[PDB]
Amino acid sequence: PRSLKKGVFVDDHLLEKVLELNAKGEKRLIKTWSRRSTIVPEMVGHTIAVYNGKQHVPVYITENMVGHKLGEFAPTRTYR
Amino acid sequence: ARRRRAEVRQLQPDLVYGDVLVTAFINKIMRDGKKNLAARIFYDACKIIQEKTGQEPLKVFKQAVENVKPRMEVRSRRVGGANYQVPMEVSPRRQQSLALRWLVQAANQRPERRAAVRIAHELMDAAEGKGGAVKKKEDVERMAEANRAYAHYRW
C-alpha cells in the first residue's frame, strides 16, 4: 500500500549515471545522496552507496528488491 | 447551596398520564439526552404492565414507588473521633429521588433483554413486594436501627 500512479519515479541524475555504466562494465560503488529514488531493473548489479545523513553505504543490489525505494536499505538512526 | 435553600424544578406533567412522577421516572430512565426513547420505553413498559396484569399501569407504578421509598437511611458523620454512621430520617423529597433512581438501576440489572421489559418487571416485582429495588431499600433501612446507638446525632 504505497504510491506510484501513472507516473513512476526515479531521481534522474543517478539514472543517467547507471544506464551509462550499462554500455560496458559495472562501477564498483556509486556515491548517491538521493535515497528518494525507486530501484529500476537496470540497477540490479552495480552496488550503489546510499547516503545516511552520515555515511554512504555498500548497498548491494539483488533482483529480489526491485520495486523498493533506495533509502529503505540505509537505516538512518542507530539503536542499542 | 451556600446562599439560598435552592428550590426544586417543576417538571411538566406526563403527555399520557398527565403526571409529574411519570416525567420524573422517564427522566431517570433517559440517558445522553435521548428523551424520546426514554418515553418510548416507559410506555412500552406500560403496555406490558397490562398484558401481564389486570391492573392499570399508573396505579401500579405509583404503587411500586411507595414500596421502595426508604423511611430511614444513614449518612456518615465526622466527629471528634472519626466516621459515625448516623441514622437519619428521610425527607419526602429525597424518598422520591431515591425510589426512582433505585428503580431504574434495579431494572437495568435484570437479565431481560428489551429495556421496556426490565422496567416492566422491576415495576411489577416491586409492587408485589419483591425485587432488587426493594432489596436495596429494606437493606438501607437495615443499617439504620443497627447504628441506632448513634441516633443521638440527629442533626
Binding site: - | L15, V16, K35, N36, A39, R40, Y43
Partner: protein, 127 residues
C-alpha cells in the same frame, strides 16, 4: 378570515394560522402527525386548544422554519397560543397562568475559550 400568531423557540420559528374548522392541523405542506411522526412530545403543541376547548373547532395551517423538531413543537405551541388571543382577547384568563403566552428564552450558550464547551472545563492534574 383566519387567525395568526408567531411563536419562536430556540432558533426555531413557527407561524400559526387559525381557520375555523374540523380540527385538521397541517404543518409545512404536510399532515401534523406525518410531520411529528413518532415524537411523543408532539401532542403538546396543541395544548393551548386543549385547554381553551378548541381541539377540533379550528383547522390550522402552520409554517415552520429552523432548528429542530422538538423546538418546533414548542414554537408552534406559542404560535397557537398567540393567535388564539388575538381572536378573543378574553382567552388570556384561561391561558396566561398555564404559561403558554411566555416565550422560552432559553437558548444555547456560547462556546468559551479555554473551556471545552462553554462550561465543560478541561481536566487537570497535580493539585
Amino acid at each position: 378570515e383566519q387567525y395568526y400568531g408567531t411563536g419562536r423557540r430556540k432558533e426555531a420559528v413557527a407561524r400559526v394560522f387559525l381557520r375555523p374548522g374540523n380540527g385538521k392541523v397541517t404543518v409545512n405542506g404536510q399532515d401534523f402527525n406525518e410531520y411529528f411522526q413518532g415524537l411523543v412530545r408532539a401532542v403538546a403543541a396543541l395544548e393551548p386548544l386543549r385547554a381553551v376547548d378548541a381541539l377540533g373547532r379550528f383547522d390550522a395551517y402552520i409554517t415552520v422554519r429552523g432548528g429542530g423538531k422538538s423546538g418546533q413543537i414548542d414554537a408552534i405551541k406559542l404560535g397557537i397560543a398567540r393567535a388564539l388571543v388575538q381572536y378573543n382577547p378574553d382567552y388570556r384568563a384561561k391561558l396566561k397562568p398555564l404559561g403558554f403566552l411566555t416565550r422560552d428564552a432559553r437558548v444555547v450558550e456560547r462556546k468559551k475559550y479555554g473551556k471545552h464547551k462553554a462550561r465543560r472545563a478541561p481536566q487537570y492534574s497535580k493539585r
